[PDB]
A paper describes a structure:
Here, the high-affinity copper(II)-binding tripeptide GHK was fused to the N-terminus of a GFP variant and an MBP-FG peptide fusion. The GHK tag promoted crystallization, with various residues (His, Asp, His/Pro) from symmetry molecules completing the copper(II) square-pyramidal coordination sphere. Rapid structure determination by copper SAD phasing could be achieved, even at a very low Bijvoet ratio or after significant radiation damage. We further show that an N-terminally fused GHK peptide can be utilized in standard crystallographic methods to enhance the crystallization of proteins and to provide reliable phasing sites for structure solution with minimal effort.
GFP proteins have commonly been crystallized in MPD with Ca2+ ions, and a second crystal form of GHK-GFP could be grown at pH 5.5 under these conditions. High-resolution data (1 × 360°) were collected at a wavelength of 1.34 Å from thin plate-like crystals to 1.3 Å resolution. The GHK tag in crystal form II shows completion of the coordination of copper(II) ions in the equatorial plane by the side chain of Asp76 from a symmetry-related molecule, since at this pH the other histidine side chains will be protonated. In this crystal form, two additional copper sites were identified, one in each molecule in the asymmetic unit. The first is a weakly ordered site with an occupancy of 0.29 coordinated by chain A residues His25 and Glu132. The second was a highly ordered site occupancy of 1.0 coordinated by chain C residues His25 and Glu132 but with additional coordination by His77 from a symmetry-related molecule. Calcium ions were also present in the crystallization conditions and we modelled an octahedral calcium site in each molecule in the asymmetic unit, with occupancies of 0.56 and 0.48, that are coordinated by Glu142 and water molecules. The sites were verified using the CheckMyMetal (CMM) server.
Residue numbers in the entry: 0 to 64, 66 to 228
Write the structure that this text describes.
């Protein structure tokens, strides 16, 4: 008698994000809480580094730190893979290649724990330059709008995504982060495998002036598009 799929997303849903990271041997954890509203495609989240100082720039973790909160227009609802997997959820895996620098590999479980949508991530960063833009903390505390191109992966009963994130560098240069993404449902329940489309993803980062801990406040608007 449980709610599944779209019915889990009719209103505002609480979100928990938990990440463990190891980048060039630097261990860290992140905890985020807030809420998602798939009716307007809006996310509001506050993140803290629970292990002290974050050894990489916050912007490099944004894509890793819940695409089930994307607004799918009424005419695109049958192409929403992300909600179709809920509540059992999906595994989201990425390779993120920073141009002229190291690579993040991520594995996340996105699923309901009671009434909360939880994103549980393990992140391994390898082959970073200790004096590069990432471990050297030379990325601006800001974020650009990006389109995430989604395609069905019928062999894996899931989806793939490819996109390049543009991180503004303090000297005015750009640090590219090439993303390779695959999502696989948890369990044997069938999912909706979409026609090619994209998620228009708009991100605003801010700081709480009263917060002493290493932290990131995030707002996102995400809208699916590209199907008629
Ligand atoms: Ca700048
Ligand atoms: Cu049920
Ligand atoms: Cu180091």
């Amino acid at each position: 008698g449980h709610k599944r799929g779209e019915q889990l997303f009719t209103g505002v849903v609480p979100i928990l994000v938990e990440l463990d990271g190891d980048v060039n041997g630097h261990r860290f954890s992140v905890r985020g809480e807030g809420e998602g509203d798939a009716t307007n495609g809006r996310l509001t989240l506050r993140f803290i580094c629970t292990t002290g100082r974050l050894p990489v720039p916050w912007p490099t973790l944004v894509t890793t730190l819940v695409q089930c909160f994307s607004r799918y227009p009424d005419h695109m609802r049958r192409h929403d893979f992300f909600k179709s997997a809920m509540p059992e959820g999906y595994v989201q895996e990425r390779t993120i290649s920073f141009r002229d620098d190291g690579t993040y590999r991520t594995r996340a479980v996105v699923r309901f724990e009671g009434n909360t949508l939880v994103n549980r991530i393990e992140l391994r960063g390898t082959n970073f330059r200790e004096d590069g833009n990432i471990l050297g903390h030379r990325l601006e505390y800001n974020y650009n709008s990006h389109n995430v191109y989604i395609t069905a992966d019928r062999q894996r009963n899931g989806i793939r995504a490819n996109f390049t994130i543009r991180h503004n560098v303090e000297d005015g240069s750009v640090q590219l982060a090439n993303h390779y993404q695959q999502n696989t449902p948890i369990g044997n329940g069938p999912v909706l495998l979409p026609d090619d489309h994209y998620l228009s993803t708009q991100t605003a980062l801010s700081r709480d002036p009263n917060e002493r801990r290493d932290h990131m406040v995030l707002l996102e608007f995400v809208t699916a598009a590209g199907i008629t």
